[PDB]
Design a protein around this nucleic acid. Structure first.
Ligand SMILES: CC(=O)NC[C@H]1CN(c2ccc(-c3ccc(CNCc4c[nH]nn4)cc3)c(F)c2)C(=O)O1
Lengths: 215, 121, 121, 113, 50
RNA sequence: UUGGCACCUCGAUGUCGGCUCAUCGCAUCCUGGGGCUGUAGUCGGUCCCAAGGGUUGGGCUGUUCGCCCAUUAAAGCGGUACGCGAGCUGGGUUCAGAACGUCGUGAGACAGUUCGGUCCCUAUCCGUCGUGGGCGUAGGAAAUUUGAGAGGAGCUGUCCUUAGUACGAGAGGACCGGGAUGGACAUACCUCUGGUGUACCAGUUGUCGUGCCAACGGCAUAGCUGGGUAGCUAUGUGUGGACGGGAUAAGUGCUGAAAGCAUCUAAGCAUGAAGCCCCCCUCAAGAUGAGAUUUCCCAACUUCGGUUAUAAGAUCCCUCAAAGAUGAUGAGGUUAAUAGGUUCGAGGUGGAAGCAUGGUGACAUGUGGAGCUGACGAAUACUAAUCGAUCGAAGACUUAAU
């Protein structure tokens, strides 16, 4: 089991050996080090921390998150590394990795071919019941005065209330989803990019998490 | 486009052209904050056509500028197009972009709208 | 063909000229059917030179669709009209001639007689 | 055109194909593996559209088999295509020749340069 | 839909808890000496001079 | 279900079908596990466990019901004011008009038909779907995170192969195991195939204006017509229900007595379901039982035994979008590439203007795949993100262990 982080770049396509189309997502993964290691003695569970993208050093103003503050600056010096945003933990991986900082490259995912990707957001904000839960509309001719509204929300005077878990308008998108059983096309050196079959969640420039498939 | 400014398609092009021809005759006007960010791009693209000087540039600038008689020359009814390509284009012959400066005044009475002042640098 | 009330033209050498779809076989709630699918249809206009008469419930395979079909290598093929061929229970056509071209993928081990009778594949 | 996009795309792009402009007769030699053996089949028609891109660039060819029209779209840099030649050129005044679909006979012909 | 019941002084005064306004957020200009808004000109004698 | 009774409502509790959205029961229609058989096999007929998921489009009728057509693994029966009109419709019945049959001396009535015919309401409280502030968690902060709990998911077909084998006079044709590819449904996404694309490009009609010709602009749905970038999208492109443990129901058992034999049960020991608890996915310490890890900070005054400001940090204001009703969340504020402009590209349109040449002309050909170009990728401080202000600690008492 292994895992890294990266930023979604875009969608492309490659040609197979005999010749076909494979939709491809471009994901760059660079500057991944181990910031901390956790054991069963303290906090009672094994894991490793990873940092993705290094940021600037300590500054006097530091009013735009581009510079690491004092609690984070002193956090990345114990691992002999640089302050890196986007810290995440990987529990499935084995603990055979030095607690001191050591870089993780994309070349470890060679011949993997079975992974899963975690998305961070969708970004819709749409409220309508037709668009959010995929409901049917009403007639548009015939004198109808019911086009895109939700129908009844319960029975009459038997329960005399609305049950929990109804399908009503509200903010949609921007939740954690995970696509399983993808494949790795090719790992490219000197660019630190990974080619994955299909498509990953999230918009461009968004953080993704690639782990070894659990099934 | 960029922002609708609370008008329709044909009304928006008639208003953006009215402010651009006003910033050439007076070089300083008072307006709203949201409309000042839009006319900022309309005038800065007309100064670029004035630095070229070709006949194809004089005709590409006649599609925006209105026909008004600036007396800034003070003689001979100079047009809004003749002030451009002339003294305006000579002032910014070395400057590369950024020929506009906007200053903020405050919320006005009866509207609560941000009054601003936009002028040629 | 694609839906329940689609009008299809019969391409093989039989009395049927235009047919009206009635059902799409394969699973329940099945909505559409592309090239290579068997359907149940009825004869609307018939030719006296043929054996099938007006108002006959028959089966037929789809051979041409205006929508098209996508292949594994990433290429698409699309036709100008819609067409079908009346077949038997064991995939045998009712007619000894096939008119017009035929989609390149019907030799799935079951329609060998149709592709051979086709003039151009 | 992100810089990391062409870095991986540069391995798939081909160059031996000759440049053609929409509205000319094109003779395409396509390899088909249909059946136990493989062989080459020729496709001859007129180029009606060509949308841009990088590796994902396609073109459309339309011909007439017998009274009915046939249209086929191929990716430009596919390995399935073996060779492409330009038999005849034509004079048009637009990039998308969508009006050819409705016409037939003496109206579906294009003048030559 | 009409109100089924009257409104209390307690319920009316709880709803207007957040019905307030804040300080305009002003600073002092070291050219005119008077208070002024941020990122704006001194409304009295002076200018921006950023 | 058709009734019986007349207990609540006549200073109003809106009736039939259909549409949208569901939820519950088991007396089970399909799938899963079994006993018996007048069960050879393939298909069945009965009864016993089992409610996890699934349970289709049309013609006729206002119709419920019912008949019929073509499919399906199957086209289940009921409760919820015969669910649902401050969510929709108004074809039926019970308004004023008119006509037929019939009845009455008549004005008029139906154990009956026919054609028309006003459906109002800005959500106070509980309820539900989203999203912020305040205080708390015995110091004040920045990141990572355990999971007591809670929700989501749960379906199935056709061929191939064991095998033309077991079984059977022949026809006909498997259980049990192993592959391939679909149907419906659910989710992410825009590289392809399409749609849209009102500050992109190009053709063209009538009229007015820039003094005129050339070249442009206003108005007529965006005047009309042919294309189309980013974004948002399905009908398009990927993925998912995988594979296993533990305890059980209906069943089958082993050993074994009460009852010298016998016997699944009383002691004891196994096996055994699409169901139960987990494994897979998401939320989750306001879990007041308020958890854990890592790093950053640490004085001056007081006789109050307690205060004030500052620190770490976080905000006011300002430029923005990967976010968004507002707010919140993210990328940045001159130790600066955050957004405009400028300078080069990608994609889109398809040959600008001027001049030259060839025709009496409308036009055509050259310099030239020219010119133009919103939302996409880079480089560049040229214009704005000035100067300032507010908030925020100095760690309670008792008992054990040192
Ligand atoms: C108008 C109003 O506001 N009423 C307030 C009260 C009264 N009411 C109410 C409502 C509906 C009815 C009612 C329901 C069905 C039928 C059957 N029809 C067919 C038929 C048979 N024979 N002949 N025709 C008749 C009447 C009622 F009997 C009572 C309610 O719900 O509250």
């Amino acid at each position: 089991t292994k895992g890294i982080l990266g930023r979604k770049i875009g969608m492309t396509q490659v040609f197979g050996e005999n010749g076909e189309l494979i939709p491809v997502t471009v994901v760059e993964a660079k500057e991944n080090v181990v910031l901390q290691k956790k054991t069963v003695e303290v906090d009672g569970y094994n894991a490793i921390q990873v940092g993705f993208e290094d940021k600037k050093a300590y500054k006097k103003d530091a009013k735009s998150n581009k510079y690491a503050n004092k609690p984070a600056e002193g956090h990345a010096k114990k691992a002999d590394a640089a302050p890196k945003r986007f810290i995440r933990e990987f529990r499935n991986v084995d603990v055979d990795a030095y607690e001191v900082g050591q870089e993780v490259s994309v070349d470890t995912f060679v011949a993997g071919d079975v992974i899963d990707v975690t998305g961070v957001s969708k970004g819709k904000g749409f409220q309508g019941a037709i668009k959010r839960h995929g409901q049917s509309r009403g007639p548009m001719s015939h004198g109808s005065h019911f086009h895109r509204a939700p129908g009844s929300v319960g029975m009459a005077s038997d329960a005399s209330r609305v049950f929990k878990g109804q399908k009503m308008p509200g903010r949609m998108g921007g939740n954690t989803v995970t696509v399983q059983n993808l494949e790795v096309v090719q790992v490219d050196t000197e660019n630190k990019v990974i080619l994955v079959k299909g498509n990953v969640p999230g918009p461009k420039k968004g953080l993704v998490e690639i782990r070894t498939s659990i099934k | 486009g960029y922002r609708k400014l609370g008008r329709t398609s044909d009304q928006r092009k008639a208003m953006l052209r009215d402010l651009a021809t006003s910033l050439i005759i007076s070089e300083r006007i008072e307006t709203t904050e949201a409309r000042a960010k839009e006319v900022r791009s309309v005038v800065e693209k007309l100064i670029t056509l004035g630095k070229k000087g070709d006949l194809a540039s004089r005709r590409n600038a006649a599609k925006t500028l209105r026909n008004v008689e600036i007396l800034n020359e003070d003689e001979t009814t100079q047009t809004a197009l003749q002030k451009l390509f002339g003294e305006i284009a000579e002032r910014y012959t070395e400057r590369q972009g950024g020929y506009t400066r906007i200053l903020k005044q405050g919320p006005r009475r009866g509207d609560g709208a941000e009054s601003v002042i936009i002028e040629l640098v | 063909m694609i839906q329940q009330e689609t009008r299809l033209k019969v391409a093989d050498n039989s009395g049927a000229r235009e047919v009206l779809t009635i059902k799409v076989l394969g699973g329940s709630g099945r909505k559409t059917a592309n090239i290579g699918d068997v359907i149940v249809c009825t004869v609307k206009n018939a030719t006296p030179g043929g054996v099938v008469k007006k108002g006959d419930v028959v089966k037929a395979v789809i051979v041409r669709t205006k929508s098209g079909v996508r292949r594994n290598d990433g290429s698409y093929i699309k036709f100008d009209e819609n067409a079908c061929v009346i077949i038997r229970d064991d995939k045998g056509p009712r007619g000894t001639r096939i008119f017009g071209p035929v989609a390149r993928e019907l030799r799935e081990g079951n329609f060998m007689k149709i592709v051979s009778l086709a003039p151009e594949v | 055109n992100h810089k990391l996009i062409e870095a991986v795309t540069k391995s798939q792009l081909r160059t031996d194909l000759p440049s053609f402009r929409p509205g000319d007769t094109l003779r395409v030699h396509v390899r088909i593996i249909e059946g136990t053996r493989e062989r080459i089949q020729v496709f001859e028609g007129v180029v009606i559209k060509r949308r841009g891109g990088g590796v994902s660039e396609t073109f459309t060819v339309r011909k007439i088999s017998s009274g009915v029209g046939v249209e086929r779209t191929f990716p430009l840099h596919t390995p399935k295509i073996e060779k492409i030649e330009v038999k005849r050129r034509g004079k048009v005044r637009r990039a998308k020749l969508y009006y050819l679909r409705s016409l037939r006979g003496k109206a579906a012909r294009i003048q030559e340069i | 839909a009409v109100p089924k019941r009257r409104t209390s002084k307690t319920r009316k005064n709880k709803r207007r808890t957040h019905f307030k306004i804040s300080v305009p957020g002003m600073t002092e200009c070291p050219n005119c000496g008077e208070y002024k808004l941020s990122h704006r000109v001194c409304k009295n004698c002076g200018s921006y001079n950023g």
